[PDB]
Design an enzyme around this catalytic site. Structure first.
Site, PDB file in Angstrom:
ATOM      1  N   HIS A  75       0.787  -1.227   0.000  1.00  0.00           N
ATOM      2  CA  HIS A  75       0.000   0.000   0.000  1.00  0.00           C
ATOM      3  C   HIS A  75       0.819   1.277   0.000  1.00  0.00           C
ATOM      4  O   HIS A  75       0.324   2.332  -0.382  1.00  0.00           O
ATOM      5  CB  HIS A  75      -0.978  -0.008   1.177  1.00  0.00           C
ATOM      6  CG  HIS A  75      -2.129  -0.941   0.980  1.00  0.00           C
ATOM      7  ND1 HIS A  75      -3.198  -1.011   1.847  1.00  0.00           N
ATOM      8  CD2 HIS A  75      -2.378  -1.844   0.005  1.00  0.00           C
ATOM      9  CE1 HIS A  75      -4.053  -1.918   1.412  1.00  0.00           C
ATOM     10  NE2 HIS A  75      -3.578  -2.436   0.296  1.00  0.00           N
ATOM     11  N   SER A 120      -0.108  -0.690  -6.543  1.00  0.00           N
ATOM     12  CA  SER A 120       0.276  -1.774  -7.443  1.00  0.00           C
ATOM     13  C   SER A 120       1.079  -1.391  -8.672  1.00  0.00           C
ATOM     14  O   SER A 120       1.039  -0.251  -9.116  1.00  0.00           O
ATOM     15  CB  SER A 120      -0.962  -2.538  -7.918  1.00  0.00           C
ATOM     16  OG  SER A 120      -1.706  -3.071  -6.844  1.00  0.00           O
ATOM     17  N   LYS A 137     -14.237  -7.590  -9.995  1.00  0.00           N
ATOM     18  CA  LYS A 137     -13.334  -8.436 -10.759  1.00  0.00           C
ATOM     19  C   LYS A 137     -12.755  -9.521  -9.859  1.00  0.00           C
ATOM     20  O   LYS A 137     -12.554 -10.647 -10.302  1.00  0.00           O
ATOM     21  CB  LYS A 137     -12.224  -7.593 -11.400  1.00  0.00           C
ATOM     22  CG  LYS A 137     -11.564  -8.258 -12.600  1.00  0.00           C
ATOM     23  CD  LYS A 137     -10.626  -7.299 -13.310  1.00  0.00           C
ATOM     24  CE  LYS A 137      -9.745  -8.053 -14.274  1.00  0.00           C
ATOM     25  NZ  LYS A 137      -8.595  -7.237 -14.726  1.00  0.00           N
ATOM     26  N   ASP A 138     -12.522  -9.192  -8.586  1.00  0.00           N
ATOM     27  CA  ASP A 138     -11.978 -10.155  -7.627  1.00  0.00           C
ATOM     28  C   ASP A 138     -13.031 -11.214  -7.305  1.00  0.00           C
ATOM     29  O   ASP A 138     -12.706 -12.387  -7.075  1.00  0.00           O
ATOM     30  CB  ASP A 138     -11.528  -9.455  -6.331  1.00  0.00           C
ATOM     31  CG  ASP A 138     -10.157  -8.802  -6.449  1.00  0.00           C
ATOM     32  OD1 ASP A 138      -9.585  -8.812  -7.563  1.00  0.00           O
ATOM     33  OD2 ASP A 138      -9.651  -8.283  -5.427  1.00  0.00           O
ATOM     34  N   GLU A 165       4.549 -34.435  -2.804  1.00  0.00           N
ATOM     35  CA  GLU A 165       3.298 -33.837  -3.238  1.00  0.00           C
ATOM     36  C   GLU A 165       3.696 -33.134  -4.530  1.00  0.00           C
ATOM     37  O   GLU A 165       4.826 -32.681  -4.643  1.00  0.00           O
ATOM     38  CB  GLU A 165       2.792 -32.826  -2.196  1.00  0.00           C
ATOM     39  CG  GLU A 165       2.541 -33.394  -0.778  1.00  0.00           C
ATOM     40  CD  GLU A 165       3.784 -33.486   0.096  1.00  0.00           C
ATOM     41  OE1 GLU A 165       4.692 -34.289  -0.204  1.00  0.00           O
ATOM     42  OE2 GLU A 165       3.848 -32.743   1.093  1.00  0.00           O
TER      43      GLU A 165
END
Ligand code: CDL
Ligand code: CDL
Ligand code: HEC
Ligand code: HEM
Ligand code: HEM
Ligand code: HEM
Ligand code: HEM
Ligand code: SMA
Ligand code: SMA
Ligand code: UQ1
Ligand code: UQ1
Lengths: 89, 49, 49, 62, 241, 365, 22, 73, 370, 74, 96
Positions: free
Chosen positions: F187, F191, F213-214, F257
């Protein structure tokens, strides 16, 4: 030697042309960050004693920063004075 | 004080007293045919005879 | 047991090959398999430990 | 023309920060040995003849 | 009845704040549990190895463990078998389950004794008083068969017959086995059984007191040093006028 | 507010920027299903495996919560790898604090998933606990001591299972606190975006644009998760963990895995104990070096053809290492894995920094 | 400058600490 | 970072329509497909090759492995 | 990294005159960290299956290196936690700190969460008190009309306390302390908006001093005294504040005849026991704690602190003596004359808070002519 | 809340000594005891009574309880 | 578990009763046998794996609750194994 030390830290006031470029870290920080209107180191002597220190004038919100940088500078000279800053003094 | 306290906590994670109680194991050899690898559980791990 | 290129042992985890002596011959293992203390007693018995 | 103990302790041990720390490390290891030995002696004396270490000789041989 | 008789305070040698248990007494106390109490009472949380360095040497404890047979297995045939005990084995249980214990004791259940001293108000004072306090029922009190009068047991009717009396066992060290002596030693042993950390916490407690005797006034001195700036400060008011 | 609602965001961030919120959702999902599983799980070696089958057979909907947790861990890694890949490609790593915290987050999630896999105490659980803790034995002088201390004994046993339940229980909450710090540093800068160019001249509010959108992204994550849970719950798992732990026998085709396969391939390629462990550690820690290896005058790879080609070579190489990790230690897989392992470090330490310099030259700066 | 002498007592400290503490 | 303090911008005009006045899917297929095709083509040479290489190494190694497990490779 | 560690500690302005009663906030922080540290280490060896829970605890105390000290530190630490909690709340009531509404109400939530947390922890060793405590307390919910019983069985995971209960309680007890930690951080954030109150109840803005070094060293001194009290209990009397009945494994067929709650729940238990009605006792219990949320609305005095209020002080100590009376009564059988003493003490408790203190406040105002 | 923004103060002078120039325990006992005694006296009538009442109720109730558990000849 | 899956509650009840399971202790502290009931798990053929191996020339018949999920190929594998026994190829000789 104390006079040399005091010359390294120096003096300063808002009318100095130097600003950010001043050699003294205290004067330089003070100018760029506007920490004070002015400051001066001093070595007042008497017969077998005296007052070695500094005086500064600043806004009510800058006292702590001024003190922090001033003492940091005394401390730096005690443990780390360089030949070049000493020659300058 | 810190040294003692810290070491007591660290120590609590090391093998507890019951885990340290070890002994020997006897194995009957006539049960292991030639060519065979026999596995036994011993002192926590596999023991090959 | 009986796997690997030496008819000893093969560790499937990262490919270590041992011989029938338990010695490391190929792969990433640094040492031969540990040989514990033991003594052959009466009968056809062996006491390990 | 002669200092006091504290003045000497100040000059050689406490003034420099590197030396004030070495002093604590050293003092701590020395104190630990003396304190544990001393307290252990006090505890065992208060309980003389009652602890396993006091009667052990009677059964030992193993 | 609902009347209660509380136990008095015996001067156990481990009663004091810095007082450790008497280990010779723990040792004799174990002989009592072994010889006398173990046929009816289990002690599921104590193993032979716990005795080592407490009241018996490692070899003595091994020998003690080998005096009993414990179940182990399965073997290679899928069957269980018996073997001599070893240091890692827990004290043998006298019964496979509580139902069997009750069946062997007219319906009463001998409780496990690992924590009996911590599980009863009065601890060893209570247990010592109970063991040495059996007496005839007072006038007007008649107990059903199977019960014994004991003023210290709640309700005063207990399903356990007096378990100890003079010469009930012989001690390894020749101590006269009077009922009170046997009671005193088994109780000391039971204290250790319920609280094996007993001696160590007190030794630590001594160190804690000494360290506090040192650190508290020193930190207090540090507190007053810093605070002196404020405690002796002086104020003055100078208004214009 | 101002940490969400009016948070300024670039107008052009793509779907590659959806993985951060998806990681947050994977974390919440793991915590929620995890707590509910912990309400029925018991960590004693005599009953661990049993308690898990009890969850799946008798606890109401226990099976769905369990498989959601197992497959959720896989989704977590898919998202983590996509998230890191986005960062490398777009130069998001120049946000140093955010990036380095991210590296810590990756290691903590790896450690967390490792310990969870041990909980059901099946065969893979047991040997994974054995192998991975033993990595520490490579540490000179005290390595073996550290391992026994972690184990609580001379071998993996009860003491191990019980403490692992405790570690696995608390670590995800620590991860959550570390992730909040991850976001706080982010923050401070806001971004990055596909162009690698400051987006201060075209910021849009996070809400409603990226909130919706998220949510769309969250729906797609849930679809992928539920396709696995409802139609192929064992696809990404290992059959050997349906067999209770057997300390006397290591399954002949034991494999890690899937999300650990690339690292396992790298370690297996070196026929030396300490060397393999150092390569393993370095294959992850090298992420911390990426910022120092940045030579390009441009932040993102969007406008850098040569860098893009090497980036996809790295992804293809990790795909190669993943495949090799699933194959036996036999010819020609041994050699393919060694080449792939060498190629991995070579692309990151030498080829990419070099492509960066060449591209600068071609642009005359 | 003073950093060697200081880094040399800081060195010592760590050493003594580990040695002892561990 | 807050709107009002991001950066300095001068002489830029932006025209917008309310979402209620416009279509959410204007020329979805008529213009979307061409754009997808364009984007796909623009990147293929950079994305695909390494994966083709993987494929070749994958098929080659797998075959080489099988062949090596039999009597007459 | 610097700031908020800092301006949130180092240069935090603090009243020059706060007394030792202000030390309990940091002591509560320390009790929380202690419980969390000893708790995690115990959790590394504890198993929640009813067949092995009690056993795993004895294994900790008998065989895990220093397991006994960690265990008794956790048990006695819970007691220290409550001693500090009650001192902390008392300080707040006496000095009018509750006027910091957000800080205060968050505090009430903290008290309830610690009580619930301690309750669940006590159930974990699965001794007799563990089992009956789980039974009784969860059943408080059965007083809820229509769904009460359903809620209980849902919490239990069955028709009675059993395996499902113990296993989920381990999970709840494990996570709640961390939730408490987050709630406490919020507690502090609201406090920082105003800074601390002081013994006089008068604003201290004209005389603030930096938290460091004055209160950092004072808090360290307090921490040492807390540790001394804790260790006196752990090393010299680890069972003093405990109950012998919990050294007996849980028996679902038999409730011990002299069963009594942990000492820090005795006052509330006395209050509930005094009302011969199910719902009535449950409501009185809930209200004995929730009434703390009402204190701010009951403040009538023109002055914040009780320092300059003689009458209010007398009533304050009567409340403390009354809680002491209820604590004593909670430890006695439900027989004469304890049944009546407890009912009077229960009535006196609510009367002092709801009526007598607000009234003393008004009278004092009159005596000062405002 | 930060120093520099707390409140307004005018015409107040404060004199202080370095902690290295003064005693940490000046007249500790000579003046401390008198002050403890004074503080104790000032509060006793406000603190003690309720607890005395508790003591009375406590002893009375306990005795009354024991008495009620015995010798009831009927 | 069979109820409502492949058998009615009564059929499953009858199935359980076809076997005897151990229970106890009774009031005498002893174990005893009783007809099985719905809550009983399918009877084990051996008390432990050692007895199993002993009864099977040393091999251990694995538990079958998860065999299909515990084997690559699942039922394809199990079906193939069950219906795939055949003579050893020429040159292969197996131990008894
Ligand atoms: C396995 C991994 C599983 C992990 C979990 C899943 C993670 C998912 C990542 C998030 C992606 C979804 C998202 O939010 O991005 C919206 C993303 C952006 O597409 P858009 O809203 O149409 O934006 C138009 C383009 O910016 C303008 O571009 P355009 O004009 O060329 O149109 C592109 C569009 C339309 O073009 C056509 O196909 C016609 O094609 C689509 O994306 C559909 O849509 C999707 O990819 C999901 C649509 C599904 C319904
Ligand atoms: C155990 C119970 C469980 C709770 C856990 C324990 C936590 C204890 C609460 C935290 C209080 C610790 C603390 O900060 O102590 C400061 C406080 C330091 O007092 P100070 O530095 O002498 O302050 C001078 C007074 O303001 C001015 O007073 P003064 O000049 O009149 O002299 C009073 C002083 C000296 O007077 C004499 O006793 C002589 O006596 C003492 O305070 C000693 O020590 C105590 O009040 C003792 C705590 C009692 C426990
Ligand atoms: C079987 C023949 C017994 C022997 C030998 C001893 N005890 Fe016992 N004890 C027995 C029973 C059946 C009971 C149950 C009594 C009841 O009515 O519930 C007891 C009980 C005890 C108790 C518990 C007392 C209590 O407060 O509940 C104790 C403390 C006790 N027994 C101690 C004890 C000791 C130390 C013994 C060896 C000296 C011993 N018992 C022998 C049965 C038997
Ligand atoms: C529990 C794991 C993690 C969570 C919850 C998480 C979450 C987030 C979130 C919410 C964002 C913002 C949205 C986005 O741009 O994706 C973000 C951005 C970012 N993260 Fe993570 N992260 C995690 C792990 C990591 C890892 C492992 C790395 C890389 C080693 C990392 C590096 C970054 C960087 C550099 C950014 C800035 C991206 C940009 O603006 O381009 N993150 N993360
Ligand atoms: C970063 C988050 C988490 C990850 C990546 C994760 C991952 C895992 C993995 C891989 C397993 C093995 C699953 C299997 O095959 O059975 C597991 C098991 C388990 N996890 Fe987690 N987990 C997370 C958080 C949690 C939390 C918060 C809890 C509990 C408070 C939890 C509780 C459990 C339990 C009890 C099991 C055992 C039952 C089972 O195997 O499903 N997990 N976890
Ligand atoms: C886990 C529990 C708690 C923690 C960790 C905690 C911690 C703190 C801390 C560190 C402070 C500042 C120092 C002090 O004045 O003591 C504080 C102040 C305060 N706390 Fe708490 N607290 C807790 C519980 C409670 C409870 C149960 C109440 C009241 C119902 C409460 C009410 C207050 C109030 C009103 C203040 C202001 C004190 C003043 O300045 O006069 N707290 N607390
Ligand atoms: C507000 C903090 C906490 C409180 C008040 C608390 C309180 C309690 C209480 C009263 C007991 C019973 C003690 C006894 O045996 O007599 C207990 C047991 C237990 N607690 Fe906590 N606890 C706290 C935090 C934690 C945490 C964070 C964990 C683990 C991560 C934990 C793990 C345990 C365990 C394992 C037990 C069972 C062993 C034992 O009885 O000592 N506790 N707790
Ligand atoms: C108390 C906590 C402890 C000790 C935590 C340790 C954490 C270590 C690392 O996480 C940071 C570690 C998980 C991470 O290394 C970076 C992985 C990529 C390592 C991957 C890994 O997995 C295997 C695995 O899963 C197996 O399963 C059955 C079997 C395995 O070989 C037989 C492996 C194996 O050979 C490797 C390298
Ligand atoms: C899943 C989580 C759940 C259901 C949590 C519920 C928490 C409820 C409350 O906490 C907020 C509660 C602990 C708190 O009420 C305010 C206490 C003061 C209640 C005190 C309390 O204790 C007893 C106790 O301990 C016992 O022990 C053996 C026995 C008891 O009677 C026989 C009691 C009892 O009669 C009461 C009122
Ligand atoms: C600015 O970056 C961020 C996101 O990326 C789009 C998020 O999804 C979310 C969710 C948060 C909180 C955030 O800060
Ligand atoms: C002045 O208020 C505060 C305290 O009381 C002295 C604390 O102890 C602590 C610890 C904090 C953080 C705080 O804000």
């Amino acid at each position: 030697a104390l006079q040399v030390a005091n010359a390294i830290i120096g003096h300063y006031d808002c009318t100095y042309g130097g600003g950010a470029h001043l050699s003294s870290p205290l004067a330089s920080i003070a100018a760029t960050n506007k920490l004070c209107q002015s400051f001066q180191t001093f070595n007042i002597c008497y017969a077998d004693t005296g007052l070695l220190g500094a005086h500064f004038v600043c806004d009510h919100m800058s006292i702590d920063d001024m003190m922090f940088v001033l003492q940091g500078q005394w401390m730096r000279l005690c443990t780390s004075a360089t030949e070049s800053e000493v020659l300058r003094g | 004080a810190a040294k003692n306290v810290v070491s007591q906590f660290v120590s609590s994670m090391s093998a507890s007293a019951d885990v340290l109680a070890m002994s020997k194991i006897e194995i009957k050899l006539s049960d292991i045919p030639e060519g065979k690898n026999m596995a036994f559980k011993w002192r926590g791990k596999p023991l090959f005879v | 047991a009986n796997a690997g290129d030496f008819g000893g042992y093969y560790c499937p985890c990262h490919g270590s090959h041992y011989d029938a002596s338990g010695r490391i011959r190929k792969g990433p293992a640094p040492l031969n398999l540990e040989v514990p203390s033991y003594e052959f007693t009466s009968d056809d018995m062996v006491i390990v430990g | 023309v002669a200092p006091t103990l504290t003045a000497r302790l100040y000059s050689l041990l406490f003034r420099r920060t590197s030396t004030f720390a070495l002093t604590i490390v050293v003092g701590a290891l020395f104190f630990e040995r003396a304190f544990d030995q001393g307290a252990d002696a006090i505890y065992e004396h208060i309980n003389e003849g009652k602890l396993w270490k006091h009667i052990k000789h009677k059964y030992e041989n193993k | 009845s609902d009347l209660e008789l509380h136990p008095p305070s015996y001067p156990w040698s481990h009663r004091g704040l810095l007082s450790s248990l008497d280990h010779t007494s723990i040792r004799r106390g174990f002989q009592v549990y072994k010889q006398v109490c173990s046929s009816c009472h289990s002690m599921d949380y104590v193993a032979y190895r716990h005795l080592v360095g407490v009241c018996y040497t490692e070899d003595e404890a091994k020998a003690l463990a080998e005096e009993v047979e414990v179940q182990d297995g399965p073997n290679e045939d899928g069957e269980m078998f018996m073997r001599p005990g070893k240091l890692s084995d827990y004290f043998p249980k006298p019964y496979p389950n509580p139902e069997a214990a009750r069946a062997a004791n007219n319906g009463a259940l001998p409780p496990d004794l690992s924590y009996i001293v911590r599980a009863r108000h009065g601890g060893e004072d209570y247990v010592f008083s109970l063991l040495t306090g059996y007496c005839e029922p007072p006038t007007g009190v008649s107990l059903r068969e199977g019960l014994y009068f004991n003023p210290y047991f709640p309700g005063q009717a207990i399903g356990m017959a007096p378990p100890i009396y003079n010469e009930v066992l012989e001690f390894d060290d020749g101590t006269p086995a009077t009922m009170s002596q046997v009671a005193k030693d088994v109780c000391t042993f039971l204290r250790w059984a319920a609280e094996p950390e007993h001696d160590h916490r007190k030794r630590m407690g001594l160190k804690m007191l000494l360290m506090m005797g040192l650190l508290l006034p020193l930190v207090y001195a540090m507190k007053r040093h810093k605070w002196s700036v404020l405690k002796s400060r002086k104020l003055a008011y100078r208004p214009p006028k | 507010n101002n940490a969400f609602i009016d948070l300024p965001a670039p107008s052009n961030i793509s779907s590659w920027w959806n993985f951060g919120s998806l990681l947050g959702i994977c974390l919440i999902l793991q915590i929620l299903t995890g707590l509910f599983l912990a309400m029925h799980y018991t960590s004693d070696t005599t009953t661990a495996f049993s308690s898990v089958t009890h969850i799946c057979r008798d606890v109401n909907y226990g099976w769905i919560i369990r498989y959601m947790h197992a497959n959720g861990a896989s989704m977590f890694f898919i998202c983590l790898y996509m998230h890191v890949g986005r960062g490398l490609y777009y130069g998001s790593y120049t946000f140093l604090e955010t990036w380095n915290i991210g590296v810590i987050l990756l290691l903590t999630v790896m450690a967390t998933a490792f310990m969870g896999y041990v909980l059901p105490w099946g065969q893979m659980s047991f040997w994974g606990a054995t192998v991975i803790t033993n990595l520490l034995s490579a540490i000179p002088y005290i390595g073996t001591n550290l391992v026994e201390w972690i184990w609580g004994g001379f071998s993996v046993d009860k003491a191990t299972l019980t403490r692992f339940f405790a570690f696995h229980f608390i670590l995800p909450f620590i991860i959550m606190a570390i992730a909040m710090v991850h976001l706080l540093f982010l923050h401070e800068t806001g971004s990055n975006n596909p162009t690698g160019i400051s987006s201060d001249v075209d910021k849009i509010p996070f809400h409603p644009y990226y909130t919706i959108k998220d949510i769309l992204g969250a729906l797609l994550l849930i679809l992928a998760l539920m396709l696995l849970v409802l139609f192929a719950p064992d696809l990404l798992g290992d059959p050997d963990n349906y067999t209770p732990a057997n300390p006397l026998n290591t399954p002949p085709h034991i494999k890690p895995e899937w999300y650990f396969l690339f690292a396992y391939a790298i370690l297996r390629s070196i026929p030396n104990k300490l060397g393999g462990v150092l390569a393993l550690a370095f294959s992850i820690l090298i992420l911390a070096l990426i910022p120092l290896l940045h030579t390009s005058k441009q932040r993102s790879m969007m406008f850098r053809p040569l860098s893009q080609c090497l980036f996809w070579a790295l992804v293809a190489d990790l795909l190669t290492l993943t495949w090799i990790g699933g194959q036996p230690v036999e010819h020609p897989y041994i050699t393919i894995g060694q080449l792939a392992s060498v190629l991995y470090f070579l692309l990151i330490l030498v080829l990419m920094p070099t492509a960066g310099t060449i591209e600068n030259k071609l642009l005359k700066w | 400058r003073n950093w060697v002498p200081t880094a040399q007592l800081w060195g010592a400290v760590g050493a003594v600490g580990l040695v002892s503490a561990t | 970072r807050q709107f009002g303090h991001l950066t300095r911008v001068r002489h830029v005009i932006t025209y917008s329509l309310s979402p209620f006045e416009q279509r959410a899917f204007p020329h979805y297929f008529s213009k979307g497909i061409p754009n997808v095709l364009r984007r796909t083509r623009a990147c293929i040479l950079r994305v695909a090759p390494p994966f083709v290489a993987f494929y070749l190494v994958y098929t080659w190694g797998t075959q080489e492995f099988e062949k090596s497990k039999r009597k007459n490779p």
